[PDB]
C-alpha cells in the first residue's frame, strides 16, 4: 500500500489543478487517470468546441465578404481538413499536460480507480492499493442518453462525444435539447452547412438564463437558418434505407398533439444532459453520499460526508464549467496544504459565455432571480438593443442586446446579460467589477471606449 | 442681441453632449456649427475610421480562409464600394444628430462664430449677435501639416482628412508619424493592399505607451508587411512624372546620415499631430488664455480665465478622445445647470483602444509612470505573451501580450496594457475595475471565462 499526501482520482481540469497546487505546497501527490489527461475540457469539450466555433465564425464572416468590397467567396467547407487540425491541436495539449505533471513531480497512475472495502479510505488501480489522508474525487461526468425502453432506437443517436468523432459534415442533422451544448452544436452544424433542426420541449432555448437572453437567443437561431422545433420530443428513432427517421410528437399548448416523421436524418445528436461519473467508484464501500442522479454531495469546502474525502468539478453537479473545477480544486489545495481554513470557492457571480452566434455572456442574477431576492420594488433594470456598427454595411444582420440588473437605492449591479458580436471577450472585466460590488455609478463614472460595443454598458440610461 | 442660457460653439462630440444635457436640465441652449454636425468624430474620425478598420480586418481574416477548411478566396478589394457605403453611413448619422438636437429643442445656428469686442462676452455669426451667461468653446482641432518653408513640397501630401476623401486604393503609400493615427492608417492601407511604409523619427511607434506595447506594436506592423522606416524624416517632396518622390534623411545613432529618394509614391500622408481650432475665434478680444500652440487653457472644471467662458474637448489639447469630450461636456452641464459644484471629469484612468492589427487596449499608468509615482521598490508587474487559440490552425500568426502594473503591498492595479485579437472589446470592464481601485486579489478572485483571451488577465502569476 503506497502512501501519498494527496491522491486525486481523475486527471481533468479540477483534478490536475488541485494536484498541481498541492504539489507547489510541498504535498506528495499522485493523479489516477484512466483515459487521457486534460479530461473533458481538452479532449471532448471546451477546446475542440472553440476551434469548431472559430470555424463556424469564419463561415459567417465569409457571407459578408462581398458587402465589404471583396469578391464573393464561393464554397464548400471541408470538414476533414479542420478535423485533422483540431485533433492535432488536442494531441499537442495532451502532451503539455503530461509534461506539466512531470515538472511538478506529480505521479500519474494510469488506470481506473475504485474505493476499497478497507477501513482507512483506500483505492485500488490495476490490483495495486494506494492511500492518502486526503483523497479528491474529480471524475467528471458524461453525456446522458435515453433508454431504449423509453425511446426506442435512441442508441442510433450520438452525443457531444460522438460529435468530435465525426469525419464528414452530416447533411441533415437534428439536435435534441435546449441547453448551451445543444445551442452551440446547432449553431456550428448550421453555419458549416448542415440542414439543422433543434428540437426543444418548450418554446425557447436557455430557459434558465435571463428571459431577454432566452428570447433573443431563440430568434437569432431562427434568423441564422436553424429550424427550432418547439414543444416537441422524440418518440422513436429508426434506421431507414438512407439515414434515420425521427418520429416526433409536437404538443403546442392549446392544441392537439401532432405526430411527424423526420426522414433522411444523417445525424441525431442528444444534448439532453450530463450524468456524473460515480457509478464504478464503489462509493458505497465507504458510504459516501450521493444524490439520486449519482452526484457526490459536498459542503461549501468540497468535503464529502466522509473525513479526508473531497469532490470537485462536474461530479458534484454544480456549475459545470472548466474554470469552476479549477478554482475549486485550487482553493481546496490551499485549505489542505496551506492550512487556510477559510479557503473555498464562492459559487456566486460565476460568469458564463455561450458560444452561440452571436455569443452570449452572463454573470450574476437574472431579472427574475433579483426580483425573488430583493423584491420587485427594489429591482431596477437597464437594457439596450442595437445593431453593431460591423453590420452598418452588410445585408446580413445580427443584434446586440444588453441588460443590467440593479438592486436597492444604490443600484448595485447584481446581473449583466448580453448577446452580441464581441460579447465572448467583453465579459471578463465586467465580471471583475460585479464581483467587487460595483454599482451603476461606478459603471457610469468609467469613461467609454469609442467606437466599441462594450461602451454601451457604461452609457445605459 | 439674442440671449440664451447656454451658447455652445462647435457642434462636435463635446459641444453636442454638453448642449443636450444642459437642455435636459431646462437650459435654453443654442449650438453654433459652421460645418457638419457630429464634427470630427462622425465625419472624419472615429466612425469612418472604424468602418475602414472592419474592412481591413476582413482582408486578414480572408488570409486564413483556406486554413479553416474553406477554398482560397482570390481577390482584389474594391475601394469604391466600401467608400460609398461608408459615406452613406456617415450621412445617416449626420441626420440623426440633427434630429437629436431638434427633439431637445436646441437651436442650431449655422455659420462660423467669433467673439466680439463687446464687454459682456458676445459672439457674432453671420452679422447677428448672440450672448449667454455661459458660453462653451468646443471647436475641436485639425490635422497639422508642415510648412513649405521647412519641408518643400509638403503640401503635396494629404492628412487623415484627405484619407477619407480618397476614391481609389493608392498603390504606394508613405505615412509620416508614429502616433495612433499614423499606426491606424498604416495598418488599414497595408491590409487592403497598398505597398505601405511608415516613417518614424525614432525606432518604435507609440512611444508614449507602455514600452511593452510600443515594442510589440512595432514588430506587429513589420510582421504584417508594413515597412517601418526608423530614424527617418522627410526632407523634401516633389511631383514627378508618375506620383511623388520623397527625399528622406535616415540618421541612425552611431552612424552616418544617409539620404534616400522614395519614388513612385501615390499617397503621402502626414500624421504628425493636431492643431487646435482657435485661430479664427478672436479670443484675444476677450483676453482668453491660450498656450503657444493655440490651445485654450482651462482649470479642472473646464473654466477658462474669463468668467462664464468654458472649453472642452480637443481644443484644450488634453486627452484627444470622443468620449472625454462627451464626459467633460456632460459634467460641465451638471455643474452649471444642476448646481453640482464638484461636477468635473477625472482625467486619470481614461481607457484607450488603438485600432491596430491586432488592436491595443490601455488604461492607467505605464510601468515607467508607476515607477516615477511610487518608486521602483513599490511597483510590481505581471505579464504574459501567447498565441491566441484562433491561430492554432493558421499559418499566419499574431500574438497577444498583456501586462498588469501593480503598486504597493496591496498590489493595486494601476495600469493594464495589452495587444491582441479581441482586446478592443475586452478593455471596457477592466477599465471599470481599475477605476474602482481593484487590486490583484480582486482580479484573481474572479472566476475565469474559458476558453477566451480575456481569462489570461485574471490568471496572471
Ligand atoms: C461539449 C462540451 C463543451 C463544453 N464547453 C465548455 C466551455 O466552453 N467552457 C467551460 O467552461 N466549460 C465547458 N464545458 C464544461 C467543462 O468542460 C467541464 O465542466 C469540465 O471539463 C469538468 O472538469 P472535471 O475536472 O470535473 O472533469 P473532467 O475533465 O471530465 O475530468 C474527469 C476525468 O476523470 C477520469 N476518470 C473518471 N473516472 C475515473 C476513475 N474511476 N479512475 C480514473 N480516472 C477516472 C476521466 O477520464 C477524465 O479524464 C463543456 C463540456 C462539454 C461536454
Ligand atoms: C482620424 C481620427 C481618428 C480618431 N479615432 C478616434 C477613435 O477611434 N476613438 C476616439 O475616442 N477618438 C478618436 N479620435 C479623436 C476624436 O474624434 C476627437 O477627440 C473628438 O472628435 C473631439 O471632439 P470635439 O467635440 O472636441 O471636437 P470636434 O468634433 O472637431 O468638433 C468641433 C466642431 O466645431 C466646429 N467649429 C470649429 N470652429 C467653429 C467656429 N468658429 N464656429 C462654428 N463651428 C465651429 C467644427 O466644424 C466641428 O464640427 C480620432 C480623430 C481622428 C482625426
From Swiss-Prot, chains A, B:
Domain of life of the native organism: Eukaryota
Cofactor binding, per record: Binds 1 FAD per subunit.
Enzyme Commission designation: 1.8.1.7
One of the record's GO cellular component terms: extracellular exosome
Family designation: Belongs to the class-I pyridine nucleotide-disulfide oxidoreductase family.
Note: The active site is a redox-active disulfide bond.
Name of this chain's protein: Glutathione reductase, mitochondrial
Species name: Homo sapiens (Human)
List of residues binding FAD: 13-14, 33, 40-41, 49, 113, 314, 322, 450
Broad class of enzyme this protein falls into: oxidoreductase
Disease: Anemia, congenital, non-spherocytic hemolytic, 10: An autosomal recessive disease characterized by hemolytic anemia and impaired activity of glutathione reductase. Patients experience hemolytic anemia in response to oxidative stress or ingestion of fava beans.
Chain positions found as N6-acetyllysine: 36
Recorded catalytic activity of this chain's protein: 2 glutathione + NADP(+) = glutathione disulfide + NADPH + H(+)
Keyword Methyltransferase recorded: no
